[PDB]
Design an enzyme around this catalytic site. Structure first.
Site, PDB file in Angstrom:
ATOM      1  CB  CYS A 191      -0.998   0.022   1.172  1.00  0.00           C
ATOM      2  SG  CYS A 191      -2.219   1.370   1.061  1.00  0.00           S
ATOM      3  NE  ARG A 229       2.480   0.596   3.599  1.00  0.00           N
ATOM      4  CZ  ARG A 229       3.639  -0.021   3.791  1.00  0.00           C
ATOM      5  NH1 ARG A 229       3.918  -0.553   4.977  1.00  0.00           N
ATOM      6  NH2 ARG A 229       4.515  -0.115   2.793  1.00  0.00           N
TER       7      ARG A 229
HETATM    8  C1  HEM Z   1      -6.105   6.384   1.688  1.00  0.00           C
HETATM    9  C2  HEM Z   1      -5.747   6.277   0.402  1.00  0.00           C
HETATM   10  C3  HEM Z   1      -5.074   4.996  -0.148  1.00  0.00           C
HETATM   11  C4  HEM Z   1      -4.341   4.949  -1.263  1.00  0.00           C
HETATM   12  C5  HEM Z   1      -4.022   6.159  -2.159  1.00  0.00           C
HETATM   13  C6  HEM Z   1      -3.876   3.588  -1.463  1.00  0.00           C
HETATM   14  C7  HEM Z   1      -3.078   3.135  -2.501  1.00  0.00           C
HETATM   15  C8  HEM Z   1      -2.845   1.806  -2.808  1.00  0.00           C
HETATM   16  C9  HEM Z   1      -2.347   1.231  -4.049  1.00  0.00           C
HETATM   17  C10 HEM Z   1      -1.938   1.961  -5.341  1.00  0.00           C
HETATM   18  C11 HEM Z   1      -2.267  -0.091  -3.896  1.00  0.00           C
HETATM   19  C12 HEM Z   1      -1.810  -1.075  -4.985  1.00  0.00           C
HETATM   20  C13 HEM Z   1      -3.046  -1.901  -5.303  1.00  0.00           C
HETATM   21  C14 HEM Z   1      -3.081  -2.362  -6.723  1.00  0.00           C
HETATM   22  O1  HEM Z   1      -2.477  -1.680  -7.589  1.00  0.00           O
HETATM   23  O2  HEM Z   1      -3.731  -3.412  -6.976  1.00  0.00           O
HETATM   24  C15 HEM Z   1      -2.726  -0.433  -2.562  1.00  0.00           C
HETATM   25  C16 HEM Z   1      -2.805  -1.696  -2.007  1.00  0.00           C
HETATM   26  C17 HEM Z   1      -3.233  -2.032  -0.731  1.00  0.00           C
HETATM   27  N1  HEM Z   1      -3.816  -1.183   0.209  1.00  0.00           N
HETATM   28 FE1  HEM Z   1      -4.117   0.797  -0.095  1.00  0.00          FE
HETATM   29  N2  HEM Z   1      -4.379   2.823  -0.417  1.00  0.00           N
HETATM   30  C18 HEM Z   1      -5.127   3.656   0.412  1.00  0.00           C
HETATM   31  C19 HEM Z   1      -5.818   3.273   1.552  1.00  0.00           C
HETATM   32  C20 HEM Z   1      -5.835   2.034   2.146  1.00  0.00           C
HETATM   33  C21 HEM Z   1      -6.638   1.610   3.281  1.00  0.00           C
HETATM   34  C22 HEM Z   1      -7.665   2.496   4.004  1.00  0.00           C
HETATM   35  C23 HEM Z   1      -6.349   0.326   3.530  1.00  0.00           C
HETATM   36  C24 HEM Z   1      -6.897  -0.611   4.633  1.00  0.00           C
HETATM   37  C25 HEM Z   1      -7.312  -0.155   5.817  1.00  0.00           C
HETATM   38  C26 HEM Z   1      -5.322  -0.079   2.582  1.00  0.00           C
HETATM   39  C27 HEM Z   1      -4.714  -1.315   2.501  1.00  0.00           C
HETATM   40  C28 HEM Z   1      -4.117  -1.860   1.384  1.00  0.00           C
HETATM   41  C29 HEM Z   1      -3.730  -3.243   1.251  1.00  0.00           C
HETATM   42  C30 HEM Z   1      -3.892  -4.379   2.294  1.00  0.00           C
HETATM   43  C31 HEM Z   1      -3.138  -3.355  -0.155  1.00  0.00           C
HETATM   44  C32 HEM Z   1      -2.577  -4.619  -0.830  1.00  0.00           C
HETATM   45  C33 HEM Z   1      -3.639  -5.178  -1.783  1.00  0.00           C
HETATM   46  C34 HEM Z   1      -3.112  -6.388  -2.522  1.00  0.00           C
HETATM   47  O3  HEM Z   1      -2.068  -6.959  -2.088  1.00  0.00           O
HETATM   48  O4  HEM Z   1      -3.741  -6.773  -3.551  1.00  0.00           O
HETATM   49  N3  HEM Z   1      -5.054   0.979   1.759  1.00  0.00           N
HETATM   50  N4  HEM Z   1      -3.054   0.753  -1.929  1.00  0.00           N
HETATM   51  F1  L5Z Z   2      -6.821 -12.512  -9.475  1.00  0.00           F
HETATM   52  C1  L5Z Z   2      -5.988 -11.836  -8.665  1.00  0.00           C
HETATM   53  C2  L5Z Z   2      -5.183 -12.515  -7.756  1.00  0.00           C
HETATM   54  C3  L5Z Z   2      -4.339 -11.785  -6.930  1.00  0.00           C
HETATM   55  C4  L5Z Z   2      -4.294 -10.397  -7.001  1.00  0.00           C
HETATM   56  C5  L5Z Z   2      -5.095  -9.728  -7.916  1.00  0.00           C
HETATM   57  C6  L5Z Z   2      -5.062  -8.214  -8.004  1.00  0.00           C
HETATM   58  C7  L5Z Z   2      -5.091  -7.640  -6.595  1.00  0.00           C
HETATM   59  C8  L5Z Z   2      -6.557  -7.521  -6.208  1.00  0.00           C
HETATM   60  C9  L5Z Z   2      -5.747  -6.267  -6.502  1.00  0.00           C
HETATM   61  N1  L5Z Z   2      -5.302  -5.652  -5.232  1.00  0.00           N
HETATM   62  C10 L5Z Z   2      -6.163  -4.536  -4.782  1.00  0.00           C
HETATM   63  C11 L5Z Z   2      -6.705  -3.689  -5.930  1.00  0.00           C
HETATM   64  C12 L5Z Z   2      -7.503  -2.552  -5.343  1.00  0.00           C
HETATM   65  C13 L5Z Z   2      -8.689  -2.155  -5.940  1.00  0.00           C
HETATM   66  C14 L5Z Z   2      -9.411  -1.117  -5.363  1.00  0.00           C
HETATM   67  N2  L5Z Z   2      -8.949  -0.513  -4.257  1.00  0.00           N
HETATM   68  C15 L5Z Z   2      -7.785  -0.910  -3.699  1.00  0.00           C
HETATM   69  N3  L5Z Z   2      -7.325  -0.286  -2.609  1.00  0.00           N
HETATM   70  C16 L5Z Z   2      -8.086   0.449  -1.810  1.00  0.00           C
HETATM   71  C17 L5Z Z   2      -7.190   0.899  -0.844  1.00  0.00           C
HETATM   72  N4  L5Z Z   2      -5.956   0.403  -1.143  1.00  0.00           N
HETATM   73  C18 L5Z Z   2      -6.042  -0.342  -2.260  1.00  0.00           C
HETATM   74  N5  L5Z Z   2      -7.075  -1.920  -4.236  1.00  0.00           N
HETATM   75  C19 L5Z Z   2      -5.944 -10.452  -8.744  1.00  0.00           C
END
Ligand code: HEM
Ligand code: L5Z
Ligand code: HEM
Ligand code: L5Z
Ligand code: H4B
Ligand code: H4B
Ligand code: ZN
EC number: 1.14.13.39
Lengths: 403, 404
Positions: A107, A110
């Site tokens: 993320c 953060r």
């Molecule tokens: C507040 C604005 C936030 C921004 C701009 C942001 C941005 C991002 C971005 C760009 C990713 C990459 C996801 C992708 O490309 O698929 C990501 C992943 C992630 N975010 Fe955020 N995030 C935000 C808030 C949060 C919040 C509120 C949470 C949870 C409380 C969170 C938890 C996570 C987690 C667990 C991932 C990993 C998802 C994965 O592994 O597929 N984020 N975030």
């Molecule tokens: F088929 C799959 C198997 C493993 C990862 C995958 C892509 C990961 C789901 C995408 N990870 C989060 C993408 C996403 C979408 C919308 N919001 C946010 N989000 C919101 C706050 N931080 C991130 N993340 C596909």
């Protein structure tokens, strides 16, 4: 020993000692690095994860060793001893969810980690109740375009009982209708979920941006289908600031990025339904969602509208188109007063975050390949920053699709 | 099912398994506790086992694994290490290991061309003047008036109780970096140190943004000597833009030949401390890294101003726009001057092909995702969507400490 972490733009060096508190394995070994893989290939266990978390919690409120600390440890200890499990206090849950976000290596958002609205939804007993909770989360987080970070936490997993689950990967997703001529109308990433929705009785559309219904599943019951009230789903039409033909493309994207299929682990307890949302980083929409070959794949379309040389790669038509698409997204969200952050502002705040974390915890778990944006990597400061990746708990994890 | 890393392409949905990684003898920087994959710099008995492993690789590659010549070469090497402490490579063994070191290099996106590599044997070289001559020959052959050709020149191996052969410069062609009295750097900041070293060793320095550095060459147990390259040997390309007519007025240029010269080439335990190699450029190396890294030439703000972009707000994507045009200019100028170059799309496409080839040939290909994915337009190229396994195979190219 401890990893020496260097920034190659500034010449500066930190040492990550936070990684020492990692109790979970990642995919790598000394023989080969698997850091680019998207997915991962008794009661004493539970009791120790529990004590550890409770310890973190009381340290967080600067009350370690105190009477309430000692007493809380015995409560947890008595509960696991008797029932094989335990339960969290709301304040602990709030703390745990915040740490999970903070510990999330992928993320880039953060910097915001301490500002998280946590809805306790552990008093939920039906799909229908889940739907009410979800709708309120959406209303709150959306907030007329002034987006606010939120999580809603549904009942934890229990031994020998099905999980509460949201089947959809996001609360808001566009349908993907597989046409029998191979092609796909809409979002190819969602062919499977769209098909599941139809089979459970949804009347389908035929557009490229049809908002899906949610399939909610209360334990050991078939999932139920809930159409989201259109007024709850805020969307942004896409238009370009100087290219007046761009709006004619009929493009749009939703405002609320809410993940609904990840698992939240706190203190050994697992929450299989705990959707969270923040605000989009523009490249998520402009680059990945709209330009990925296996998504909407609009690069060539835009490139032709810009009258570009599609014939050869060396004209950089792809790169030119991509930039305008990302520009269109930032301009459109800005015009609609919906919260968005570009990859430059995003990674700049992430660097500041790495700095805060170094002083606070002695390190920060980060996944370089995910933090570095999908265009313009080395143009951003995170590209030039070495990072250590590891698993701390509380944590968000992936989990199997429930079907 | 299979007990080897599973590797997925997410664009295409395709799965492979890497069995090749099992052949890895050297550990990397990662552990089950933490991934250090993003860090840039992370006895006769010993030699014999490395040597045996290589001779086996060599005989396997010519399909005589198990043969009489094979078992004899093993006994020859074992007996040679026995009386001297080292051994020497046959010519075609050197050629095989040179190519295999390139083929094994996880960070190199150009490995599709690995079979076509000119190997110049220079293990007879005995002076610094001779090193310079061999280097000039390399530059002449590799440059080929703009029609570039992969090549490597191999100087004598490390010898027990005798000083190394070393090229002090990191590349055969490098622009000088002059530290200013006002703290700034004129030229290439990457090269401030090597520049100051050349001066200390008697170089009379220019004061341009693009002064080619002399080479500091070092023969065994001797001080480095200085050699100036004759300008006509060093092919340069002036940078212009195909539509923005003012770009040519910026006076930017880049050299044609990308030649790495401070890397150690290890083959079967034998260490070649000076073994410069060269390919041709992928355009983002010049247009993005060299010309736009903040700690390099850093011309992004300059170009943007000329393009009349709003440099006061990140959200204008002015960095992205300028960076695209600078890369376009790199490409257009090399094309116009008929100097070989590959753009980041063509390069990654070809590297995907390489992966497929190696999957069949060796059952995998060690690759460093952070280094293979280009610095602009990442997910626009196919390798972004390709999972990769990274590990050390030998023969190998390795970083070595600076001689000073
Ligand atoms: C507040 C604005 C936030 C921004 C701009 C942001 C941005 C991002 C971005 C760009 C990713 C990459 C996801 C992708 O490309 O698929 C990501 C992943 C992630 N975010 Fe955020 N995030 C935000 C808030 C949060 C919040 C509120 C949470 C949870 C409380 C969170 C938890 C996570 C987690 C667990 C991932 C990993 C998802 C994965 O592994 O597929 N984020 N975030
Ligand atoms: F088929 C799959 C198997 C493993 C990862 C995958 C892509 C990961 C789901 C995408 N990870 C989060 C993408 C996403 C979408 C919308 N919001 C946010 N989000 C919101 C706050 N931080 C991130 N993340 C596909
Ligand atoms: C034929 C055309 C070639 C192309 C297009 C090419 C491309 C590249 C690129 C883009 C890099 C990344 C370096 C950086 O970003 O700083 C690289 C690294 C590398 N290349 Fe090549 N290369 C070519 C030829 C060769 C040859 C002939 C050899 C050796 C015989 C070689 C060995 C290596 C090695 C060892 C690295 C890693 C360098 C490091 O870790 O610092 N390459 N290559
Ligand atoms: F200061 C540093 C410490 C460690 C690595 C660093 C960057 C790596 C040197 C660059 N890797 C080689 C770059 C390069 C330049 C010219 N040609 C080629 N080249 C030629 C063929 N294939 C690659 N590579 C800086
Ligand atoms: C194979 C590769 O690791 C994979 O495509 C990753 C790369 N980095 C990413 N980065 C982000 N933000 N999101 C992603 O889905 C991915 N995918
Ligand atoms: C910190 C990070 O590992 C570092 O900036 C790397 C990232 N990827 C790279 N990729 C290439 N091709 N060349 C590089 O020098 C780097 N640098
Ligand atoms: Zn790793």
């Amino acid at each position: 020993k401890f990893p020496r972490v260097k920034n190659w733009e500034l010449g500066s060096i930190t040492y990550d000692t936070l990684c020492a508190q990692s109790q979970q394995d990642g995919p790598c070994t000394p023989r080969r690095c698997l850091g680019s893989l998207v997915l991962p290939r008794p009661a004493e266990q539970l009791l120790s994860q529990a004590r550890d978390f409770i310890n973190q919690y009381y340290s967080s409120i600067k009350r370690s060793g105190s009477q309430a600390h000692e007493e809380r440890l015995q409560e947890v200890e008595a509960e696991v001893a008797s029932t094989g499990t335990y339960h969290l206090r709301e304040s602990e849950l709030v703390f745990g969810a915040k740490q999970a976000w903070r510990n999330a290596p992928r993320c880039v958002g953060r910097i915001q980690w301490g500002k998280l609205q946590v809805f306790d939804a552990r008093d939920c007993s039906s799909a229908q109740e889940m739907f009410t909770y979800i709708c309120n989360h959406i209303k709150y987080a959306t907030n007329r375009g002034n987006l606010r970070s939120a999580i809603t936490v549904f009942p934890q997993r229990a031994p020998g009982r099905g999980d509460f689950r949201i089947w959809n990967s996001q609360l808001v997703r566009y349908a993907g209708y597989r046409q029998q001529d191979g092609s796909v109308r809409g979002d190819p990433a969602n062919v499977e979920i769209t098909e599941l929705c139809i089979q459970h009785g949804w009347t389908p559309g035929n557009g490229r941006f049809d908002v899906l219904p949610l399939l909610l599943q209360a334990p050991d019951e078939a999932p139920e289908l809930f159409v989201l009230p259109p007024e709850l789903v805020l969307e942004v039409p896409l238009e370009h600031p100087t290219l007046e033909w761009f709006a004619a493309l009929g493009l749009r994207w939703y405002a609320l990025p809410a993940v609904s299929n990840m698992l939240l682990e706190i203190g050994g307890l697992e929450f299989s339904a705990a959707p969270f949302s923040g605000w989009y980083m523009s490249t998520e929409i402009g680059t990945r969602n709209l330009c990925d070959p296996h998504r909407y794949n609009i690069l060539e379309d835009v490139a032709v509208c810009m009258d570009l040389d599609t014939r050869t790669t060396s004209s950089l038509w792809k790169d030119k188109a991509a930039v305008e698409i990302n520009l269109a997204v930032l301009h459109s969200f800005q015009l609609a007063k919906v919260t968005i952050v570009d990859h430059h502002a995003a990674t700049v705040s992430f660097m500041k975050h790495l700095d805060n974390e170094q002083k606070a915890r002695g390190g920060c778990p980060a996944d370089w390949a995910w933090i570095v944006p999908p265009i313009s990597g080395s143009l951003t400061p995170v590209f030039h920053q070495e990072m250590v990746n590891y698993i701390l708990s509380p944590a968000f994890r992936y989990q199997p699709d429930p079907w």
